[PDB]
């Protein structure tokens, strides 16, 4: 019953491989509808052609600014930042999908993907998801970032959707 949706990653324009997500619905389903949503772009606006603006080895993948490219962007499909729907999942491991914020419910667009066990976010980011296919594509996008985040090569979501 929870939703799938996949990302296909390019860097520098070339395509890289296929990440596929498991939304946790059955727990947070306003935060794994607003990130299906985007994905498929049902709304007019969306994560297709967005980048990864934010890579640092060991820790994480952010992306989802599909608005300004650079962290400062972004919207969800509410006309508004919205509520931290709760904090039931954890930062266990690699794989985890959660969500950027900027303080206390101001969810948006923007999202990671952790590469490590993240437990000092627990209570701060909504975790909504996992990696259910292509952890290593993930993995070889974790090595065109850098110790403060700065991408060496451009690292793209090429197109997206949901699957099954």
Same mark, same amino acid.
């Given at each position: =019953?929870?939703?799938?949706?996949? /990302? @296909?990653?390019?860097?520098?324009?070339?395509?890289? !491989?296929?990440?596929?997500?498991?939304?946790? #619905? *059955? $727990?947070?389903?306003?935060?794994?509808?607003? /990130?299906?949503?985007?994905?498929?772009?049902?709304?007019?606006?969306?994560? $297709?052609?967005?980048? /990864?603006?934010?890579?640092?080895?060991?820790? &994480?993948?952010?992306?989802?600014?599909?608005?300004?490219?650079?962290?400062?962007?972004?919207?969800?499909?509410?006309?508004? %930042?919205?509520? @931290?729907?709760?904090?039931?999942? $954890?930062?266990?491991?690699?794989?985890?999908?959660? &969500?950027?914020?900027?303080?206390?419910?101001?969810?948006?667009?923007?999202? +990671?993907?952790?590469?490590? %066990?993240?437990?000092?976010? *627990?209570?701060?980011? =909504?975790? +909504?998801?996992?990696?259910?296919?292509? &952890?290593?594509? =993930?993995?070889?996008?974790?090595?065109?970032?850098?110790?403060?985040?700065?991408?060496?090569?451009?690292?793209?979501? #090429? *197109?997206? !959707?949901?699957?099954?």
């Amino acid at each position: =019953v929870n939703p799938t949706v996949f /990302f @296909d990653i390019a860097v520098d324009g070339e395509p890289l !491989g296929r990440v596929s997500f498991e939304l946790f #619905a *059955d $727990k947070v389903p306003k935060t794994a509808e607003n /990130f299906r949503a985007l994905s498929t772009g049902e709304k007019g606006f969306g994560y $297709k052609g967005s980048c /990864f603006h934010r890579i640092i080895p060991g820790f &994480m993948c952010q992306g989802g600014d599909f608005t300004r490219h650079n962290g400062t962007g972004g919207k969800s499909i509410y006309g508004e %930042k919205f509520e @931290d729907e709760n904090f039931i999942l $954890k930062h266990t491991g690699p794989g985890i999908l959660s &969500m950027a914020n900027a303080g206390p419910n101001t969810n948006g667009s923007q999202f +990671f993907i952790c590469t490590a %066990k993240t437990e000092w976010l *627990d209570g701060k980011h =909504v975790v +909504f998801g996992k990696v259910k296919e292509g &952890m290593n594509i =993930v993995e070889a996008m974790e090595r065109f970032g850098s110790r403060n985040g700065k991408t060496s090569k451009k690292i793209t979501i #090429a *197109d997206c !959707g949901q699957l099954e």
